[PDB]
Amino acid sequence: NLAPLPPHVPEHLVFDFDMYNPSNLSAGVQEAWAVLQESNVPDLVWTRCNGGHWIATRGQLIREAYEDYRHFSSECPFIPREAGEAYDFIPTSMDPPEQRQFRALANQVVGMPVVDKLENRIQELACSLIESLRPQGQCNFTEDYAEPFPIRIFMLLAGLPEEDIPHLKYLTDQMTRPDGSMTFAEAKEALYDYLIPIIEQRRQKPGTDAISIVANGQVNGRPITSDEAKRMCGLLLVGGLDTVVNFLSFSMEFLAKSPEHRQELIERPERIPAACEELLRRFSLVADGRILTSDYEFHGVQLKKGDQILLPQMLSGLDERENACPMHVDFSRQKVSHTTFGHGSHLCLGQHLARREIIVTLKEWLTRIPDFSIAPGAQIQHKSGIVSGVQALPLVWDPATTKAV
Numbered sequence: 253n254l255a256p257l258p259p260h261v262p263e264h265l266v267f268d269f270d271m272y273n274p275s276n277l278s279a280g281v282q283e284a285w286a287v288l289q290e291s292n293v294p295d296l297v298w299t300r301c302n303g304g305h306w307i308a309t310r311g312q313l314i315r316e317a318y319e320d321y322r323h324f325s326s327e328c329p330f331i332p333r334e335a336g337e338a339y340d341f342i343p344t345s346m347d348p349p350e351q352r353q354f355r356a357l358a359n360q361v362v363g364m365p366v367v368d369k370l371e372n373r374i375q376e377l378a379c380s381l382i383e384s385l386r387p388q389g390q391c392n393f394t395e396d397y398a399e400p401f402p403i404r405i406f407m408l409l410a411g412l413p414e415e416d417i418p419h420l421k422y423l424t425d426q427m428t429r430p431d432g433s434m435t436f437a438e439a440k441e442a443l444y445d446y447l448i449p450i451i452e453q454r455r456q457k458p459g460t461d462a463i464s465i466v467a468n469g470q471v472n473g474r475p476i477t478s479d480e481a482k483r484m485c486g487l488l489l490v491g492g493l494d495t496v497v498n499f500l501s502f503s504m505e506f507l508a509k510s511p512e513h514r515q516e517l518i519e520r521p522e523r524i525p526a527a528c529e530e531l532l533r534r535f536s537l538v539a540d541g542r543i544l545t546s547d548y549e550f551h552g553v554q555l556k557k558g559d560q561i562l563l564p565q566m567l568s569g570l571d572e573r574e575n576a577c578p579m580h581v582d583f584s585r586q587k588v589s590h591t592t593f594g595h596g597s598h599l600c601l602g603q604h605l606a607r608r609e610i611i612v613t614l615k616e617w618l619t620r621i622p623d624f625s626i627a628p629g630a631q632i633q634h635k636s637g638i639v640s641g642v643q644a645l646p647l648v649w650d651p652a653t654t655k656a657v
């Protein structure tokens with residue numbers, strides 16, 4: 253279903269890429285998106301799928317657009333338009349200088365100092381989860397570790413019950429990888445229906461949890477409104493439940509297929525931090541965009557006010573002009589360049605937490621289960637969207653080769 257080409261779009265710039273269902277998906281989601289960087293594809297193209305929008309395919313252009321909020325506004329960051337319009341999360345749906353005040357508050361709840369204080373908890377849960385799996389000799393990584401590990405840590409930080417995870421998770425997934433079961437507006441309403449009562453309570457009887465902190469925070473001298481707190485917690489929910497969760501699976505899927513890379517990390521632990529950056533580059537998974545605030549000629553192409561443009565954070569590090577042999581995983585790259593956590597004023601505030609969770613997982617897993625592989629016959633399937641993911645990841649190993657710690 254392609255949308256009619258708008259008058260200002262030159263047909264030689266047309267390339268019908270569907271971000272929710274790319275063509276070479278079977279080859280891997282990152283590989284599927286990388287077709288946009290083939291020699292036959294211009295740096296800036298227009299796709300008629302999902303309503304019609306531009307797509308910047310090079311790291312240089314993606315960075316430029318993200319730095320220039322004057323022309324590319326965050327007001328409508330999601331494609332399709334209906335999604336971008338129903339999208340009202342703070343601070344992502346705001347442009348500076350407005351964004352700055354809310355960003356400061358959000359940093360208060362997921363910033364570095366918070367990660368430092370939760371460190372022992374993150375480590376305890378990781379060790380506990382892995383030790384429990386170790387003797388089984390098999391598991392579905394996605395549901396057995398990738399989901400429980402990061403999500404339980406977030407629920408702990410947010411002070412929310414573990415019983416609500418299945419419900420909250422489903423709603424979140426509908427926003428990043430639409431099933432077709434419900435519209436973005438409906439999924440958002442549902443999520444807000446959940447948060448509203450909680451924020452109300454946390455406003456009267458404040459706690460030490462992230463929500464209590466946000467609900468009673470101060471913005472620009474004055475206090476945050478109920479509506480504002482609601483829209484910020486909504487974003488925190490999506491970030492805590494659908495980012496690290498998917499990234500861990502891409503990484504584990506790769507480690508299960510490359511004994512050499514596992515060995516490398518086991519023998520030279522001082523390389524884990526670097527390996528983390530390289531994996532964040534190779535398995536980048538986020539792709540959202542901006543909306544043109546006015547007519548603007550960008551790198552020779554005429555963009556029209558109201559035009560939406562997808563700026564795939566995932567593509568920057570896969571661009572060969574940025575990283576030689578982009579598809580190759582090399583832990584000793586002299587320079588790992590990517591924009592996996594974003595670029596510009598909207599740089600991910602939860603990246604410190606994410607990096608901590610990734611590093612702990614790699615270290616603690618490889619310590620107890622150094623040898624593992626993908627279950628014979630299993631076909632790993634990826635899913636594309638605002639945040640890409642893995643359907644399932646069946647793993648198997650010989651318990652006799654594991655190490656209890």
Ligand code: HEM
Binds near residue numbers: 489491499595601602
């Ligand atoms: C591998 C994990 C993650 C990735 C790749 C990731 C990626 C991103 C990206 C690309 C943006 C910018 C979006 C834009 O410019 O429109 C962003 C923003 C943000 N992320 Fe993350 N994120 C991750 C984990 C998290 C976590 C764990 C949280 C915490 C709940 C979170 C909280 C935030 C916040 C608060 C923002 C908005 C910042 C602002 O608009 O000023 N993220 N993230």
